[PDB]
Every structure is written in C-alpha cells, then in structure tokens.
Amino acid sequence: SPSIVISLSTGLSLFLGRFVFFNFQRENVAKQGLPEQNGKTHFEAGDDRAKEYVSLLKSNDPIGFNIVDVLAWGSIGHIVAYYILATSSNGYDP
Amino acid sequence: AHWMPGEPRPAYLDGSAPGDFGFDPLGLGEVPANLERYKESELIHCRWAMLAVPGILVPEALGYGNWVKAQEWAALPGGQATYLGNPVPWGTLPTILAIEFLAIAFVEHQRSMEKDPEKKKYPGGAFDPLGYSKDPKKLEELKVKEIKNGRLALLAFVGFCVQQSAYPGTGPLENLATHLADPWHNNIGDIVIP
Amino acid sequence: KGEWLPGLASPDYLTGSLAGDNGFDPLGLAEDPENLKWFVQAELVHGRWAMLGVAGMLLPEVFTKIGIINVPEWYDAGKEQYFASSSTLFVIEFILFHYVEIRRWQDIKNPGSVNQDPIFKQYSLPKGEVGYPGGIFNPLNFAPTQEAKEKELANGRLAMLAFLGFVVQHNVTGKGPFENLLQHLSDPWHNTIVQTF
Amino acid sequence: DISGLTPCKDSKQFAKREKQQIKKLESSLKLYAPESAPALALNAQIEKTKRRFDNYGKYGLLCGSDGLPHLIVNGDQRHWGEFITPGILFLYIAGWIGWVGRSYLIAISGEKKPAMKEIIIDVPLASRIIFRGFIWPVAAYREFLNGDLIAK
Numbered sequence: 181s182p183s184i185v186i187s188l189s190t191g192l193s194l195f196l197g198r199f200v201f202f203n204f205q206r207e208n209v210a211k212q213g214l215p216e217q218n219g220k221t222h223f224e225a226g227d228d229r230a231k232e233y234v235s236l237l238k239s240n241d242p243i244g245f246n247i248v249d250v251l252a253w254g255s256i257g258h259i260v261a262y263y264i265l266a267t268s269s270n271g272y273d274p
Numbered sequence: 275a276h277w278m279p280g281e282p283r284p285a286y287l288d289g290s291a292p293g294d295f296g297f298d299p300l301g302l303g304e305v306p307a308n309l310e311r312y313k314e315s316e317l318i319h320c321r322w323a324m325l326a327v328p329g330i331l332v333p334e335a336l337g338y339g340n341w342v343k344a345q346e347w348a349a350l351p352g353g354q355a356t357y358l359g360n361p362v363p364w365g366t367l368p369t370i371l372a373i374e375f376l377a378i379a380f381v382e383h384q385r386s387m388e389k390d391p392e393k394k395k396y397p398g399g400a401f402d403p404l405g406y407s408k409d410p411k412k413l414e415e416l417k418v419k420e421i422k423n424g425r426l427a428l429l430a431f432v433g434f435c436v437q438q439s440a441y442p443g444t445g446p447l448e449n450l451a452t453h454l455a456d457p458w459h460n461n462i463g464d465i466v467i468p
Numbered sequence: 469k470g471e472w473l474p475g476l477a478s479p480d481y482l483t484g485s486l487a488g489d490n491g492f493d494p495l496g497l498a499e500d501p502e503n504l505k506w507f508v509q510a511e512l513v514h515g516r517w518a519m520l521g522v523a524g525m526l527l528p529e530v531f532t533k534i535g536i537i538n539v540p541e542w543y544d545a546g547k548e549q550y551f552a553s554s555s556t557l558f559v560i561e562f563i564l565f566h567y568v569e570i571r572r573w574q575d576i577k578n579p580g581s582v583n584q585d586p587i588f589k590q591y592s593l594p595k596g597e598v599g600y601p602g603g604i605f606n607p608l609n610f611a612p613t614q615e616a617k618e619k620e621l622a623n624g625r626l627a628m629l630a631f632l633g634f635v636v637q638h639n640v641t642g643k644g645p646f647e648n649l650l651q652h653l654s655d656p657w658h659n660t661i662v663q664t665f
Numbered sequence: 666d667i668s669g670l671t672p673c674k675d676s677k678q679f680a681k682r683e684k685q686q687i688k689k690l691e692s693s694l695k696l697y698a699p700e701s702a703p704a705l706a707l708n709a710q711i712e713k714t715k716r717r718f719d720n721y722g723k724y725g726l727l728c729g730s731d732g733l734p735h736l737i738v739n740g741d742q743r744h745w746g747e748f749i750t751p752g753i754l755f756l757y758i759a760g761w762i763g764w765v766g767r768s769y770l771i772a773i774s775g776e777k778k779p780a781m782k783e784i785i786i787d788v789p790l791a792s793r794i795i796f797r798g799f800i801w802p803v804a805a806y807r808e809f810l811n812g813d814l815i816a817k
C-alpha cells in the first residue's frame with residue numbers, strides 16, 4: 181500500500197524537522213548570513229530582484245515553522261518513501 | 275609515570291587530567307579545543323567498546339554461532355532475526371533500520387545539546403542512580419580506572435577485528451581454544467611468515 | 469698512542485683518549501663528535517656480538533672433528549628440526565630483543581636515565597660510563613681498567629675479521645672452516661687460495 | 666606464466682629465430698675459403714650467437730608470443746636481477762659521483778676566487794676527495810640526521 185508508506189515517511193520527516201532538528205538548522209542558518217559581494221548583500225549592492233520575501237516567511241506557528249520548511253521536509257520524506265517503494269519493488273539479492 | 279622512561283614530556287600534558295601519561299609523538303594536541311574534542315571522542319569510543327566487548331563474549335559462549343554469523347541473516351532476502359534461539363516476529367531490515375536511525379539520532383542529538391565541556395564528559399545527576407560520584411575523593415581514582423579499562427577494551431576490539439580478518443568465519447573463543455591446543459605450533463608465526 | 473702507518477700524521481679529532489685509538493680514519497667518518505660517539509657505541513656492540521658468533525660457529529666444529537659430539541655445521545643448523553617451529557622462536561626473539569634494545573637506545577640517548585628497575589624500585593645500577601654498564605652485568609666484579617677495554621676491542625676486531633673470512637671462504641668453497649685449515653695444512657703450497665680456484 | 670607468457674627455454678619461436686640467424690651467417694660463410702681469415706671470423710660470430718642464445722635460455726627469461734624476451738619490473742622474487750638488482754647498483758655509483766662533486770665544491774668555497782679552481786681543476790685535493798665517496802650512504806645519512814645537508 182503506497183499511501184500508508186508515503187504518509188508515514190512524510191509524517192516522520194515532518195516530526196523530525198519540527199521537534200528535533202529545528203534549533204540546529206535555525207542556528208546554522210543564522211550563522212551563515214545572506215550572500216555578500218564586496219562586503220554588501222546582493223539587495224544592498226543594487227540588485228532589486230534579490231529582495232528577501234519577508235511577507236511569505238512570516239507565520240503564526242508558536243516556534244516559527246513556515247511554508248519553506250514544510251516543503252523541504254516533505255520533499256525529503258517523499259524521496260525516502262519512494263526509494264523504499266522502488267527498492268521493495270524488485271527482488272534483487274546480493 | 276611517563277610512557278617511556280628517559281623521554282621528555284610534552285608541554286601541554288602535565289599529568290593533571292586523569293589517565294594522562296604524556297604520550298603524543300605526533301603532537302596532535304597543541305590546540306586546546308582540539309585536545310578537548312579528542313578527550314570527548316576517546317571517552318565515547320572507550321565507553322562504546324566497553325559496552326560492546328561483553329556483547330561479543332557472552333554469545334558464542336552458548337550454542338549461538340558468533341558475532342559474524344549473527345549478521346548474515348540480513349544478507350539473505352526476506353530473512354528474519356533471532357534472539358536466544360527464538361525468531362523475533364518483527365525482524366526485517368526496513369523497520370529495524372528505521373527504528374535504529376530514529377532512536378539513535380534522537381539520543382545523540384539530545385546528547386550534543388549540552389554546552390559545558392565538563393558536563394559533556396561527565397554528565398552526572400540522573401545518569402547515576404546509585405550515586406558513586408557524590409564523594410570527590412574517589413572520583414579521580416574511578417575516572418583513571420575507567421580510562422584504563424576503556425583503553426584495554428579498545429585494544430581488545432582491535433585484536434578481535436584482526437583475528438577475524440586473519441581467519442574468516444572464526445570467533446575469538448575458538449581462536450583461544452586452537453591456540454591452547456598446541457601453544458608451540460598455533461601462534462602468530464604462521465600468518466606473519468608464509 | 470701508536471700509529472697504524474709510520475710516516476703519516478694522525479687526525480686531530482682522534483686524541484688518543486678513547487680506548488684502542490691508533491688514529492686509523494683515512495676516509496674521515498668520525499669528524500663530528502656526535503658521529504664519533506655513535507660509531508664508538510657501534511664498534512662496541514657490533515663486535516661484542518661478533519666474538520660470541522665466531523666462537524659459536526668455530527668451537528663446535530673442532531669438538532665434532534675430534535669426536536666427542538656430533539653437531540651439524542653452522543650452515544645446516546637452520547635446516548635442522550627443533551622442538552618448536554622457527555617462526556615462534558623468531559617472534560620470541562623479536563619481542564625480547566625489541567625490549568632490550570629500546571632500553572639500550574634510551575640509555576645512549578639520555579645517559580643515566582634507565583638505571584632504575586621498573587618492577588622492583590629498590591634495585592638500581594651504579595652510575596658509570598655509557599657502553600660499560602657494570603653492576604649486575606659484572607657478577608665477578610672484575611676491574612674495568614683501560615687495559616681490559618683495549619684487550620676487548622682488539623679481540624672484537626679479530627672477531628670481525630674471523631667472521632668475514634669464515635663467511636666468504638665458505639661461499640667460495642662449500643667446505644667448512646676447520647676442514648679448510650686442515651686441507652691447507654695437508655700441503656701449504658698446493659692448497660692455498662691461488663692454487664685452487 | 667606471468668601475464669600469459671611462455672618460458673624462454675620452452676618456446677619454439679626462439680629456436681626458429683636462432684636457426685634463421687645461423688643460416689644467414691652460414692650462407693655468407695660458404696663464399697670464402699674454409700681456411701681463410703673471414704671464415705674464422707664468421708665461425709667466431711656463429712659461436713657467439715650460439716653462446717648468447719644458450720645463456721638467454723639458461724638465465725630464466727620469458728619470451729613472448731612473437732618470440733622475444735620480456736623484462737618484468739613488477740617486483741616478483743624470480744626477477745630480482747631483471748630490474749631491481751641492477752638498478753640499486755646504478756644508484757650506488759650515481760650517488761658516488763654526486764657526493765664527490767658536492768664535496769669538491771665545498772672544498773673550494775673557502776678561497777677568495779673559486780672560479781680559478783673550477784675552470785682549472787687541481788689533482789691532489791680531487792684525488793683526496795674521490796675515495797671518500799665509497800661510503801657515501803653512511804656520511805649522507807649522518808649529515809641528514811645532523812641537519813647539515815640543507816642550507817638555512
């Protein structure tokens with residue numbers, strides 16, 4: 181049953197992102213700021229298309245889960261689930 | 275108490291740390307942060323090997339095969355694991371691997387969140403219910419004993435791996451039995467020179 | 469002291485203070501003092517081994533020839549079978565020699581540092597010169613005079629020459645050394661190196 | 666044996682090549698008188714060819730498919746003298762030369778005008794220096810340990 185495996189993997193990845201690895205990832209992202217050219221960020225140097233989308237990333241979550249994190253963790257879960265399904269599909273043995 | 279009498283001690287190693295004998299031929303401990311990280315890694319390796327060596331010795335002492343055959347069931351497709359001669363109903367590769375990954379990752383990430391360097395090596399508190407660490411007088415002796423036993427366990431693991439490599443499909447206990455079969459014939463000689 | 473070649477001036481660094489000094493260094497190896505000390509220790513130990521080796525490869529042959537014991541020649545000792553395999557004996561020798569030689573090297577590097585017994589702390593070796601430990605190594609407590617050192621060095625040099633001669637003269641002629649001497653004594657003018665091969 | 670090769674004392678192309686060379690020589694031998702000097706020279710050539718082939722066969726080389734010997738620089742114990750045994754010898758001799766030259770240069774660095782000693786060699790000092798290279802590995806190792814090999 182592909183649906184059960186997909187849902188379980190997505191839920192496990194979402195839980196791991198939200199409740200376990202959140203602080204480490206947030207701290208690491210804060211450590212590595214926006215890309216800089218000649219000591220200035222891309223938006224500051226005179227690029228108008230590089231403005232950060234502050235409006236989209238704002239969220240009502242108590243800790244700060246946003247759309248981008250949801251998409252990333254769901255993508256990882258789906259990749260893992262589909263790899264599991266494809267591996268279980270055939271009958272190759274070493 | 276130096277490792278080699280007649281040889282000068284390094285500057286950064288004076289003997290204050292437990293189980294310190296001034297042994298560093300390659301000078302890897304110059305950076306203090308590197309020294310602390312090395313201490314952490316050494317302690318973790320010692321603890322893991324100490325927990326692992328009896329896990330090899332007690333099996334293969336009963337009717338069960340050895341620490342290598344108990345790993346071959348995962349190679350065969352559709353295999354199932356066994357415990358104490360009884361097949362575990364939930365023994366299969368995907369569930370076992372996922373459970374191991376989740377549990378170990380959570381435990382290790384919980385461990386890595388500690389900040390004080392001293393509290394990382396010796397957490398204390400809830401990890402010791404008996405409470406041997408309340409008295410500071412015996413703490414240094416216990417730490418030195420732990421370090422020495424951990425180093426011995428690491429050497430034991432090296433010996434186990436090398437003996438297994440020399441004789442495929444052979445356990446340490448049957449190796450000791452074969453050595454005791456004829457001490458003057460079954461030694462390291464026949465493998466060191468063909 | 470003496471001269472190894474009359475009409476030749478001795479090198480300056482060789483001042484005759486060392487035991488067995490004849491000023492023989494045509495190729496000038498011992499110019500630096502550190503090299504001199506290292507080569508002195510080498511000439512000691514190298515040669516202290518050679519005397520024992522030469523006696524061991526010579527005396528049993530004489531005893532066998534005169535007939536008390538039947539012992540294989542020094543070449544065929546390795547081909548003979550013993551109580552244990554050669555590999556185990558080699559490993560035992562390797563470990564023991566590793567220990568003793570590392571002790572000696574540590575003593576040479578840092579004199580007066582490894583005299584104390586690691587196991588029994590009370591026992592120790594009395595202070596002395598490097599290369600002549602004395603103490604427990606001298607049970608009969610002979611006098612370590614300069615004359616004894618010179619005699620030992622001369623005997624060691626003779627042992628070097630004897631061992632080299634033994635090896636090469638067995639290589640050219642498969643016959644043993646004592647039998648070679650007896651063959652030469654049979655007729656000196658027809659059995660020398662030049663006459664035969 | 667090794668890499669699909671044939672021992673040189675068992676292959677047939679070796680013998681065929683030997684026969685071809687011998688016949689080529691004997692064709693020219695017939696032209697002259699048997700007692701004449703060219704006959705003696707050609708007989709010597711034939712003897713040399715036969716001896717060379719016999720020595721090559723007895724030395725344990727390995728001919729290939731086409732019939733010529735092949736050298737093995739791999740490191741097998743049956744071919745110690747093919748590459749490794751000569752090569753070490755070369756190094757020894759080579760080192761000798763280098764060492765000697767270096768020494769001579771230092772021996773003329775003290776004087777005020779070493780150029781005159783470079784373009785016009787002196788024989789006494791050079792003859793003193795020449796024989797010191799017979800033990801070059803030992804002196805070189807001692808100098809490397811001491812630290813006088815590299816300038817500072």
Ligand code: CLA
Nearest residue numbers: 762763764765766767768769770786787790791792794795
């Ligand atoms: C006198 C001894 C001598 C020594 C010790 C060296 C040493 C060295 N050479 Mg130099 N070199 C020399 C002479 C010497 N050279 C001469 C005469 C020339 C001009 C032909 C060169 C031209 C040269 C080049 C173009 C290069 C080196 C390089 C090197 C280095 C690598 C080794 C090698 O590639 O050799 C190369 C060797 C040669 C091409 C020929 C040398 C053979 C000469 C003729 C022998 C010396 C003989 C001399 C006349 C003896 C007189 C002494 C007598 C009076 C007692 C090494 C440091 C290489 C490098 O830079 O490495 C980092 C490199 O690229 N050398």
Ligand SMILES: CC(/C=C/C=C(C)/C=C/[C@@]12O[C@]1(C)C[C@@H](O)CC2(C)C)=C\C=C\C=C(C)\C=C\C=C(C)\C=C\[C@@]12O[C@]1(C)C[C@@H](O)CC2(C)C
Nearest residue numbers: 492493494495496515517518521524525542545628631632
């Ligand atoms: C140690 C030694 C021999 C040791 C032998 C041993 C232990 C033998 C043991 C055994 O036999 C037994 C007992 C029993 C057998 O069953 C087994 C074996 C194993 C066979 C020889 C050294 C032999 C050493 C030799 C020959 C050294 C010679 C050095 C020379 C001549 C140097 C000369 C110069 O260096 C000077 C002095 C000054 C410079 O200026 C000029 C030059 C010319 C460079």
Ligand SMILES: CC1=C(/C=C/C(C)=C/C=C/C(C)=C/C=C/C=C(C)/C=C/C=C(C)/C=C/C2=C(C)CCCC2(C)C)C(C)(C)CCC1
Nearest residue numbers: 190191194250251252253254255256258259260261262263
């Ligand atoms: C509202 C809310 C909630 C809920 C939430 C949820 C429920 C969520 C979910 C979410 C999700 C559920 C998500 C998901 C996502 C997903 C994704 C993002 C995916 C991706 C995918 C991919 C990327 C794929 C790919 C591929 C392909 C295409 C093909 C094949 C191959 C592969 C697999 C590679 C809660 C109650 C909690 C709280 C309150 C509020």
